[PDB]
């Protein structure tokens, strides 16, 4: 996250921190995700497509810090790693950039909710806030494009939804942005998602309810004028989510 503020997991209790194990025993941060039910975290396919082996992954919930423990945090293996079969990537745009991780503790259990571990609601079908709505993003992504390490402490910021018409101007992203995506940005271009925030939540208040409206997906640079952050539009993937969270 460029700009915004440091935060703690109690403020974003659906946030999931996803890591990958390496030969030799090092663990690196991969991407964020969001708890959508006790057993299921939703994230972005581009985070996993090169290392699709579910055994390589560790998911934390209730975790506020990147490389140290948070009281109440819980650790999970990935029982099933589901990538979108229609995922693809062009020069800039990622398409169908959405994934599901079925989580389970080493004892075989799903998440137990607590003050620091909570589910976030899905939107209803094609139900999105109006453009100009303020929504929040959360992540362990870069604080500056020149950074080469992620921050140690979770961050959040607030961005506004941008219309498709604005986002599809040739000098923005033109037709690279589709109906299955949502753009959001800071009106002054000072705060944004960045590398490392992929897979994390774009949360908006929809009809009085905190809703997973988007998933951090792509964009050109970080907090660059006329280049919004682009998000998977969750409300256009409900049948996919429904079907893969079953058998």
Ligand X SMILES: Cc1cc(C(=O)Nc2cc(Cl)cc(N3CCCCC3)c2)cc(C)c1OCCN
Q: Does 177 bind ligand X (CB under 6 A)?
A: no
* Contact by Cβ (8 Å): 230, 183: yes
* Contact by Cβ (8 Å): 75, 50: no
86 given a catalytic annotation: no
The interface region with ligand X, picked from 18-26, 100-108, 203-211, 221-229 by CB under 6 A, is 221-229
* From candidates 34, 43, 191, 193, binder to ligand X by CB under 6 A: 193
197, burial (CB in 10 Å: exposed 0-12, middle 13-18, buried 19+) = buried
97 given a catalytic annotation: yes
Q: Does 33 bind ligand X (CB under 6 A)?
A: no
* From candidates 14, 222, 234, 236, binder to ligand X by CB under 6 A: 222
Cα distance between residue 208 and residue 205, in whole Å:
6
**Cβ atoms within 10 A of the Cβ of 71, count?**
8
* Contact by Cβ (8 Å): 136, 221: no
Q: Which two tokens stand for residue 142?
A: 């870069």
* From candidates 7, 34, 198, 211, binder to ligand X by CB under 6 A: 198
The interface region with ligand X, picked from 54-62, 161-169, 194-202, 236-244 by CB under 6 A, is 194-202
Cα distance between residue 68 and residue 63, in whole Å:
9
Q: Does 184 bind ligand X (CB under 6 A)?
A: no
| Least distance between ligand X and beta carbon 238 (Å) | 23
Q: Does 219 bind ligand X (CB under 6 A)?
A: yes
Q: Which residue is nearest to ligand X (CB)?
A: 219
**Which has the closest alpha carbon to 162: 149, 171, 154, 172?**
172
CA 105 to chain centre: 21
Q: Which two tokens stand for residue 220?
A: 């050109």
Q: Does 39 bind ligand X (CB under 6 A)?
A: no
**Cβ atoms within 10 A of the Cβ of 211, count?**
24
Q: Which listed residue (46, 94, 95, 236) is catalytic?
A: 46
86, burial (CB in 10 Å: exposed 0-12, middle 13-18, buried 19+) = exposed
* From candidates 17, 192, 213, 233, binder to ligand X by CB under 6 A: 192
* From candidates 60, 218, 233, 234, binder to ligand X by CB under 6 A: 218
| Least distance between ligand X and beta carbon 133 (Å) | 18
Q: Does 229 bind ligand X (CB under 6 A)?
A: yes
Q: Which listed residue (34, 64, 198, 217) is catalytic?
A: 198
Cα distance between residue 213 and residue 36, in whole Å:
12
46 given a catalytic annotation: yes
Q: 113: which DSSP letter?
A: P
Q: Which listed residue (94, 97, 235, 244) is catalytic?
A: 97
Q: Which is nearer to ligand X, 21 or 104 (CB)?
A: 21
Catalytic residue numbers read 46, 97, 198
Residues that bind ligand X (CB under 6 A): 46, 89, 192-195, 197-198, 216, 218-219, 221-222, 229
């Amino acid at each position: 996250i460029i700009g915004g503020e440091f935060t703690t997991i109690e403020n974003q209790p659906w946030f999931a921190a996803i890591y990958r194990r390496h030969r030799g025993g090092s663990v690196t941060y991969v991407c964020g995700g969001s708890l959508i039910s006790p057993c299921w975290v939703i994230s972005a396919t581009h985070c996993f497509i090169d290392y699709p082996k579910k055994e390589d992954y560790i998911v934390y919930l209730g975790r506020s810090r990147l490389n140290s423990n948070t009281q109440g945090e819980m650790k999970f293996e990935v029982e099933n790693l589901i990538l979108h079969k229609d995922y693809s990537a062009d020069t800039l745009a990622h398409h169908n950039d959405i994934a599901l991780l079925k989580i389970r503790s080493k004892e075989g259990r799903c998440a137990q909710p607590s003050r620091t571990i909570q589910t976030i609601s899905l939107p209803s079908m094609y139900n999105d806030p109006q453009f100009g709505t303020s929504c929040e993003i959360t992540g362990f992504g870069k604080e500056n494009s020149t950074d080469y390490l992620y921050p140690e402490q979770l961050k959040m910021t607030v961005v506004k939804l941008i219309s498709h018409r604005e986002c599809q101007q040739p000098h923005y992203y033109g037709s690279e942005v589709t109906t299955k995506m949502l753009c959001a940005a800071d009106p002054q271009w000072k705060t944004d998602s960045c590398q490392g925030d992929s897979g994390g939540p774009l949360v908006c208040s929809l009809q009085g309810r905190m809703t997973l409206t988007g998933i951090v997906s792509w964009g050109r640079g970080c907090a660059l004028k006329d280049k919004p952050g682009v998000y998977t539009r969750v409300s256009h993937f409900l049948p996919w989510i429904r079907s893969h969270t079953k058998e």
